[PDB]
Motif scaffolding. Structure first.
Motif, PDB file in Angstrom:
ATOM      1  N   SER A  48       0.809  -1.213   0.000  1.00 14.53           N
ATOM      2  CA  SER A  48       0.000   0.000   0.000  1.00 14.53           C
ATOM      3  C   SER A  48       0.845   1.266   0.000  1.00 14.53           C
ATOM      4  N   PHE A  49       1.877   1.316   0.840  1.00 18.16           N
ATOM      5  CA  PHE A  49       2.838   2.408   0.847  1.00 18.16           C
ATOM      6  C   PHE A  49       3.467   2.524  -0.534  1.00 18.16           C
ATOM      7  N   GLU A  50       3.778   1.375  -1.138  1.00 14.36           N
ATOM      8  CA  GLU A  50       4.446   1.367  -2.434  1.00 14.36           C
ATOM      9  C   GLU A  50       3.575   1.997  -3.513  1.00 14.36           C
ATOM     10  N   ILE A  51       2.316   1.561  -3.626  1.00 11.80           N
ATOM     11  CA  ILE A  51       1.454   2.101  -4.676  1.00 11.80           C
ATOM     12  C   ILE A  51       1.185   3.579  -4.424  1.00 11.80           C
ATOM     13  N   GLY A  52       0.955   3.945  -3.158  1.00  6.19           N
ATOM     14  CA  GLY A  52       0.733   5.346  -2.840  1.00  6.19           C
ATOM     15  C   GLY A  52       1.900   6.228  -3.232  1.00  6.19           C
ATOM     16  N   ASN A  53       3.123   5.755  -2.984  1.00  7.30           N
ATOM     17  CA  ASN A  53       4.299   6.534  -3.355  1.00  7.30           C
ATOM     18  C   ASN A  53       4.477   6.592  -4.868  1.00  7.30           C
ATOM     19  N   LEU A  54       4.359   5.445  -5.544  1.00  6.76           N
ATOM     20  CA  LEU A  54       4.701   5.379  -6.962  1.00  6.76           C
ATOM     21  C   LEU A  54       3.684   6.113  -7.824  1.00  6.76           C
ATOM     22  N   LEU A  55       2.405   6.091  -7.437  1.00  3.67           N
ATOM     23  CA  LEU A  55       1.382   6.700  -8.279  1.00  3.67           C
ATOM     24  C   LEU A  55       1.549   8.210  -8.389  1.00  3.67           C
ATOM     25  N   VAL A  56       2.104   8.851  -7.363  1.00  4.16           N
ATOM     26  CA  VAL A  56       2.182  10.305  -7.336  1.00  4.16           C
ATOM     27  C   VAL A  56       3.608  10.839  -7.306  1.00  4.16           C
ATOM     28  N   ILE A  57       4.637   9.988  -7.226  1.00  3.37           N
ATOM     29  CA  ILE A  57       6.000  10.506  -7.136  1.00  3.37           C
ATOM     30  C   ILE A  57       6.360  11.321  -8.374  1.00  3.37           C
ATOM     31  N   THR A  58       6.068  10.797  -9.567  1.00  2.00           N
ATOM     32  CA  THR A  58       6.426  11.505 -10.793  1.00  2.00           C
ATOM     33  C   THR A  58       5.637  12.800 -10.935  1.00  2.00           C
ATOM     34  N   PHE A  59       4.333  12.752 -10.651  1.00  2.00           N
ATOM     35  CA  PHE A  59       3.501  13.946 -10.744  1.00  2.00           C
ATOM     36  C   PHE A  59       4.010  15.041  -9.817  1.00  2.00           C
ATOM     37  N   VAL A  60       4.258  14.699  -8.551  1.00  2.00           N
ATOM     38  CA  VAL A  60       4.763  15.690  -7.610  1.00  2.00           C
ATOM     39  C   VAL A  60       6.117  16.216  -8.065  1.00  2.00           C
ATOM     40  N   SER A  61       7.024  15.317  -8.457  1.00  2.00           N
ATOM     41  CA  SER A  61       8.382  15.727  -8.793  1.00  2.00           C
ATOM     42  C   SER A  61       8.406  16.664  -9.990  1.00  2.00           C
ATOM     43  N   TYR A  62       7.535  16.435 -10.969  1.00  2.00           N
ATOM     44  CA  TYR A  62       7.540  17.276 -12.170  1.00  2.00           C
ATOM     45  C   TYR A  62       6.795  18.586 -11.930  1.00  2.00           C
ATOM     46  N   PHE A  63       5.618  18.520 -11.303  1.00  2.00           N
ATOM     47  CA  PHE A  63       4.772  19.705 -11.218  1.00  2.00           C
ATOM     48  C   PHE A  63       5.032  20.566  -9.986  1.00  2.00           C
ATOM     49  N   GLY A  64       5.877  20.116  -9.059  1.00  2.00           N
ATOM     50  CA  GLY A  64       6.138  20.915  -7.880  1.00  2.00           C
ATOM     51  C   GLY A  64       7.445  21.675  -7.939  1.00  2.00           C
ATOM     52  N   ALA A  65       8.225  21.444  -8.997  1.00  2.00           N
ATOM     53  CA  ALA A  65       9.492  22.149  -9.147  1.00  2.00           C
ATOM     54  C   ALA A  65       9.286  23.648  -9.315  1.00  2.00           C
ATOM     55  N   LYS A  66       8.274  24.052 -10.083  1.00  2.00           N
ATOM     56  CA  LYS A  66       8.032  25.468 -10.322  1.00  2.00           C
ATOM     57  C   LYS A  66       7.073  26.086  -9.314  1.00  2.00           C
ATOM     58  N   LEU A  67       6.495  25.289  -8.421  1.00  2.00           N
ATOM     59  CA  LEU A  67       5.584  25.787  -7.406  1.00  2.00           C
ATOM     60  C   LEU A  67       6.355  26.108  -6.127  1.00  2.00           C
ATOM     61  N   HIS A  68       5.623  26.402  -5.055  1.00  2.00           N
ATOM     62  CA  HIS A  68       6.219  26.702  -3.758  1.00  2.00           C
ATOM     63  C   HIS A  68       6.675  25.390  -3.129  1.00  2.00           C
ATOM     64  N   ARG A  69       7.944  25.044  -3.330  1.00  2.00           N
ATOM     65  CA  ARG A  69       8.482  23.762  -2.888  1.00  2.00           C
ATOM     66  C   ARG A  69       8.409  23.564  -1.374  1.00  2.00           C
ATOM     67  N   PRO A  70       8.799  24.551  -0.532  1.00  2.00           N
ATOM     68  CA  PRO A  70       8.682  24.343   0.919  1.00  2.00           C
ATOM     69  C   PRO A  70       7.264  24.025   1.372  1.00  2.00           C
ATOM     70  N   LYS A  71       6.274  24.697   0.784  1.00  2.00           N
ATOM     71  CA  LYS A  71       4.889  24.432   1.153  1.00  2.00           C
ATOM     72  C   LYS A  71       4.414  23.061   0.694  1.00  2.00           C
ATOM     73  N   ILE A  72       4.870  22.582  -0.463  1.00  2.00           N
ATOM     74  CA  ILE A  72       4.520  21.231  -0.886  1.00  2.00           C
ATOM     75  C   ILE A  72       5.150  20.200   0.043  1.00  2.00           C
ATOM     76  N   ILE A  73       6.377  20.453   0.501  1.00  2.00           N
ATOM     77  CA  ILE A  73       7.004  19.568   1.478  1.00  2.00           C
ATOM     78  C   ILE A  73       6.214  19.566   2.781  1.00  2.00           C
ATOM     79  N   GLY A  74       5.767  20.742   3.225  1.00  2.00           N
ATOM     80  CA  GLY A  74       4.956  20.804   4.433  1.00  2.00           C
ATOM     81  C   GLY A  74       3.647  20.049   4.294  1.00  2.00           C
ATOM     82  N   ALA A  75       2.992  20.188   3.139  1.00  2.00           N
ATOM     83  CA  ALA A  75       1.761  19.445   2.891  1.00  2.00           C
ATOM     84  C   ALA A  75       2.016  17.943   2.882  1.00  2.00           C
ATOM     85  N   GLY A  76       3.122  17.517   2.269  1.00  2.00           N
ATOM     86  CA  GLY A  76       3.476  16.108   2.299  1.00  2.00           C
ATOM     87  C   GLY A  76       3.718  15.600   3.707  1.00  2.00           C
ATOM     88  N   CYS A  77       4.376  16.411   4.538  1.00  2.00           N
ATOM     89  CA  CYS A  77       4.574  16.039   5.936  1.00  2.00           C
ATOM     90  C   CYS A  77       3.251  15.921   6.679  1.00  2.00           C
TER      91      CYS A  77
END
Ligand SMILES: C[C@]12CC[C@H]3c4ccc(OS(=O)(=O)O)cc4CC[C@@H]3[C@@H]1CCC2=O
Ligand SMILES: C[C@]12CC[C@H]3c4ccc(OS(=O)(=O)O)cc4CC[C@@H]3[C@@H]1CCC2=O
Ligand SMILES: C[C@]12CC[C@H]3c4ccc(OS(=O)(=O)O)cc4CC[C@@H]3[C@@H]1CCC2=O
Length: 545
Positions: A48-77
């Protein structure tokens, strides 16, 4: 000053995530040893951890580079903390424990899913933010500190798991004065839920500093259009692609080595599971953390370029697997087990077709074939069970049980447990410990040089995307597959299979020492050699360009 604050916050987040994963693993390990969960269900929990991580890792990594990175990290936390808290939820709905899968594992699955989802932005966005605004000399040091915090974290998770297991399950809910059972009682149940609450609270606290960190230090449609060209640009880059292949092969080696290193210690050197876990958690893991930190410090202090980083990576891999090759000479032979390694006549190597758990000496006793209750005889030969040794009487003396009138032993006393390996195996175990610690340090020495290799040959706008792709590849091609086939090939060397309560095949009790050692070391060394060849190719291309 802002960069140091971000570094501290990211280190604390890495520590929280590592503590959560360590507590999960340590708690599940103990639960497996006291309670009986079918392996499919714990596999589902892990996946379950695996599918949750893999399904969104690429989306987050690509689309969060130009956004507010510290806030995305906080939301992930925040998501990670919420998921971790959700795991401990069933304790608040189940009845008081009185001294097996229905509508209650949904909480655990959802909690692990959200914990995997919240994990994705931490590494790519955090490391990219750290690399973008730090000087080229300090970026390697900061990455080294972050990874050192990541490696150490699970030790604290395991310690918290032990402390929680030392507490009663209904602490806070039930007056503990009425509890008459001790942790040594087989019906004792630990407070598994408390550690999940603690980890969730820590993860939630870790997200606070990122709300005050700035987006940069001194629309969606366009990203969607540029996504496909960016992937080709990353994979069109040969340094990045070949380092990705090198890391994939090397981690295929390393995950397999790490997963079955406990079991290798227990089976090859006769140590208990507790000792095997101790020498790994408190000796090998500190060596790994020290190696990572030393690599980062070496990169920072001497201002090592990309070519020097590749050279250091190659040298660390070469001198790590060279020392790992030395473990072939440090092997003890199979313990004398009647009917599996030797006959009841004490005859050395017996073949496959002669596996004779029933013999003349124990024909008078109707013994169970499946049960593995090993006893060590006075003659130095271990027997699968006391029944198979022909023992008629048992006397409890102190903490030990002594069996008498054992017909097979007399061909007559015996104690509980396996006979110790006599001829210099403890010395071989000591040499193995020393060489394995040195090997772990040497292999970890190149962790940060490879990380700098991953970052210094791509265009700076794609650091987050490249880190996400790297993490996805390591998880999918190394993290998941390496344990499976390592275990299968290792399982080919089993001599006696235990069973669970439902009759399903449990963990193997007795392996063939020679075949086990050959497979376990050879797979790791071959994969490491392939990784070394790929690293040489990477170095050649760096020299060319
Ligand atoms: C997986 C788990 C160990 C024991 C688990 C369990 C064991 C029997 C059980 O009994 S059941 O009949 O309600 O299914 C329920 C549960 C609910 C989840 C619970 C823990 C969550 C975290 C953990 O380490
Ligand atoms: C009470 C329980 C039966 C078995 C229990 C158990 C047994 C050993 C154990 O291992 S221990 O090291 O924590 O002592 C933990 C637990 C955690 C709770 C778990 C179940 C939840 C629902 C259930 O029916
Ligand atoms: C640092 C590292 C994570 C796990 C590390 C490890 C962990 C346990 C270990 O030995 S072990 O007995 O504790 O299993 C050896 C090593 C060798 C280096 C290895 C990796 C290299 C790159 C990486 O990300």
């Amino acid at each position: 000053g802002e960069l140091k604050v971000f570094l501290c916050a990211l280190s604390f987040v890495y520590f929280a995530k590592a503590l959560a994963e360590g507590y999960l693993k340590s708690t599940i390990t103990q639960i497996e040893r006291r309670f009986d969960i079918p392996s499919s269900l714990v596999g589902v929990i892990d996946g379950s951890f695996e599918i949750g991580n893999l399904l969104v890792i690429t989306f987050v990594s690509y689309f969060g580079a130009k956004l507010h990175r510290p806030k995305i990290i906080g939301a992930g936390c925040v998501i990670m903390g919420v998921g971790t808290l959700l795991i401990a939820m069933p304790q608040f709905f189940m009845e008081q424990y009185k001294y097996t899968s229905s509508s209650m594992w949904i909480y655990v699955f959802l909690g692990n899913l959200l914990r995997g989802i919240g994990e994705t932005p931490i590494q790519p966005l955090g490391i990219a933010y750290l690399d973008d605004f730090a000087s080229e000399d300090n970026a390697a040091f900061y990455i080294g500190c972050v990874q050192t915090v990541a490696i150490i974290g699970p030790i604290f998770g395991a310690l918290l798991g032990s402390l929680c297991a030392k507490l009663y399950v209904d602490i806070g809910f039930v007056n503990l004065d009425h509890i008459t059972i001790t942790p040594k009682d087989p019906q004792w149940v630990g407070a598994w839920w408390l550690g999940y609450l603690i980890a969730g609270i820590i993860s939630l606290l870790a997200a606070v500093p990122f709300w005050y960190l700035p987006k940069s230090l001194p629309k969606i449609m366009e990203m969607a259009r540029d996504f496909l060209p960016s992937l080709k640009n990353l994979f069109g880059n040969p340094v990045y692609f070949l380092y990705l292949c090198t890391s994939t092969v090397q981690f295929n080696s390393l995950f397999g080595m790490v997963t079955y290193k406990p079991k290798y210690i227990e089976q090859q050197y006769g140590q208990s599971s507790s000792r095997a876990n101790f020498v790994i958690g408190l000796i090998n893991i500190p060596a790994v953390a020290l190696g990572i930190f030393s690599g980062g410090i070496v990169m920072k202090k001497f201002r090592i370029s990309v070519c020097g980083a590749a050279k250091l990576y190659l040298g660390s891999s070469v001198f790590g697997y060279l020392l790992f090759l030395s473990l072939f000479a440090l092997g003890c032979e199979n313990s004398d087990v009647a009917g599996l390694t030797v006959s009841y006549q004490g005859t050395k190597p017996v073949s496959y077709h002669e596996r004779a758990l029933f013999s003349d000496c124990n024909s008078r006793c109707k013994c169970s074939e499946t049960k593995w209750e090993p006893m060590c005889g006075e003659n130095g030969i271990t027997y699968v069970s006391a029944c198979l040794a022909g023992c008629q009487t048992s006397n409890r003396s102190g903490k030990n049980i002594i069996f008498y009138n054992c017909t097979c032993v007399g061909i007559s006393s015996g104690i509980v447990g396996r006979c110790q390996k006599d001829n210099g195996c403890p010395q071989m175990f000591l040499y193995f410990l020393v060489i394995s610690v040195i090997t772990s340090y040497t292999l970890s020495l190149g962790g940060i040089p490879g990380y700098i290799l991953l970052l210094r040959c791509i265009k700076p706008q794609l650091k987050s995307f490249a880190l996400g792709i790297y993490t996805l590849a390591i998880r999918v091609l190394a993290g998941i597959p390496a344990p499976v086939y390592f275990g299968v090939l290792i399982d080919t060397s089993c001599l006696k299979w235990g069973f669970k309560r439902c009759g399903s095949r449990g963990s193997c009790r007795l392996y063939d020492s020679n075949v086990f050692r050959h497979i376990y070391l050879g797979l790791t060394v071959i994969l490491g050699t392939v990784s070394i060849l790929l690293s040489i190719a990477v170095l050649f291309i760096l020299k060319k360009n």
